[PDB]
Design an enzyme around this catalytic site. Sequence first.
Site, short mmCIF file in Angstrom:
data_model
loop_
_atom_site.label_atom_id
_atom_site.label_comp_id
_atom_site.label_asym_id
_atom_site.label_seq_id
_atom_site.Cartn_x
_atom_site.Cartn_y
_atom_site.Cartn_z
N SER A 204 -38.05 29.55 -73.21
CA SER A 204 -38.58 27.99 -72.76
C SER A 204 -40.20 28.12 -72.91
CB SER A 204 -37.94 28.03 -71.34
OG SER A 204 -36.66 27.98 -71.12
N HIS B 196 -29.49 23.94 -71.16
CA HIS B 196 -30.60 24.66 -70.83
C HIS B 196 -30.52 26.14 -70.72
CE1 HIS B 196 -28.85 24.00 -66.58
NE2 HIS B 196 -29.26 25.20 -66.59
N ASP C 152 -31.26 20.23 -76.88
CA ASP C 152 -32.07 20.96 -75.56
C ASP C 152 -32.14 19.93 -74.52
OD1 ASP C 152 -33.43 23.69 -75.11
OD2 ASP C 152 -34.70 22.05 -74.36
C1 LIG Z 1 -38.10 23.71 -69.55
C2 LIG Z 1 -38.60 24.92 -69.99
O1 LIG Z 1 -39.22 25.02 -71.45
C3 LIG Z 1 -40.34 24.75 -71.99
C4 LIG Z 1 -41.42 23.97 -71.02
C5 LIG Z 1 -42.43 23.33 -71.88
C6 LIG Z 1 -42.54 23.74 -73.14
C7 LIG Z 1 -43.66 23.27 -74.15
C8 LIG Z 1 -43.41 23.05 -75.44
C9 LIG Z 1 -44.41 22.81 -76.24
C10 LIG Z 1 -45.59 22.51 -75.64
C11 LIG Z 1 -45.85 22.65 -74.24
C12 LIG Z 1 -45.04 23.23 -73.30
C13 LIG Z 1 -41.68 24.48 -73.89
C14 LIG Z 1 -40.42 24.83 -73.30
C15 LIG Z 1 -39.17 25.92 -69.00
O2 LIG Z 1 -40.36 26.33 -69.41
O3 LIG Z 1 -39.00 25.87 -67.61
#
Ligand SMILES: C[C@@H](Oc1ccc(-c2ccccc2)cc1)C(=O)O
Length: 341
Positions: A145, A287, A242
Amino acid sequence: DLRLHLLLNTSVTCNDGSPAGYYLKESRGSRRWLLFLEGGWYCFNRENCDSRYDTMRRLMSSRDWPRTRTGTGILSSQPEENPYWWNANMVFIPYCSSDVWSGASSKSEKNEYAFMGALIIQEVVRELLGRGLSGAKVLLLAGSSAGGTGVLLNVDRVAEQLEKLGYPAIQVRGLADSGWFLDNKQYRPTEAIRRGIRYWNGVVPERCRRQFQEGEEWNCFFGYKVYPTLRSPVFVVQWLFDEAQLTVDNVHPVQEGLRLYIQNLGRELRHTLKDVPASFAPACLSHEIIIRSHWTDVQVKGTSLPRALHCWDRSLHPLKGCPVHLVDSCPWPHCNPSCPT
Ligand SMILES: C[C@@H](Oc1ccc(-c2ccccc2)cc1)C(=O)O
Ligand SMILES: *[C@@H]1O[C@H](CO)[C@@H](O)[C@H](O)[C@H]1NC(C)=O
């Protein structure tokens, strides 16, 4: 069980100034080291971070962390649960910087919070060298994530750090799970990351920074833009549909407009992976992440993720019967029968 160690350099801190840390389980018969980055979104201004501190404090502070954690999935030491790397040295690095692992800014009279994710990774690596990492043959930096995006932002810096410190024999590689996003049009987010980067003093990999230049470094948080600039080998795991991508896209009896939107999302994701030789991208709405106990169950074209990662190891020493590029072609969630339920 992995045992907690708070960083000995107490100036490398979580958001609230408490020391950052890592959980470690050593395997003295092995020269493989797995360092895993936790995820959990981010926060981008004072008011947003204050809300996170009230109800997600473990993601901002070490004051309440437990003495141990259980390793699961790719962090499990049991061969049946982890066919890939069950005998490795295992490290879990808690996410307590709220900056997608990009920050290098301390708490001060002008900053209520510290955003030190990039520095936390470097200090963990430095302190592990004296606990056996100096003898390693492979260091796999993995994460899920926001931690998967963190791998893309930090793998080349770890490689450079180890070379400059005098350890040229350690092969640094990355595994980015569920951190490969598209800056697409919503069905009904880039401003928040742009404001966040300024708030954190966030840093991105050097070649990507030089392509996009000042004011545009937010581009380097998107896997399809930063991946081509990286020198270290990186394996990408990403569901074609996703759930976090769909949430930011405001998607929750499906009629034609939404059917076309979802089909186009999967096609765009597939296209971005065409030139990524080590990848695993199943046609599922999920997820779920690689530290879950049943991560062995999903297959693409008859090959599981633990097998593909083993084939990747072999390729870094095409292979008959041992593939590394596994992207589903079917166009709708759960057209792959092995998707999680
Ligand atoms: C939902 C899950 O995943 C992500 C959340 C945000 C990001 C992300 C991507 C690109 C730029 C900034 C933030 C990537 C994955 C978590 O962390 O719980
Ligand atoms: C502790 O970390 C800070 C921030 O990275 C650094 O400035 C300082 O030199 C470190 N201290 C030692 C003794 O390495």
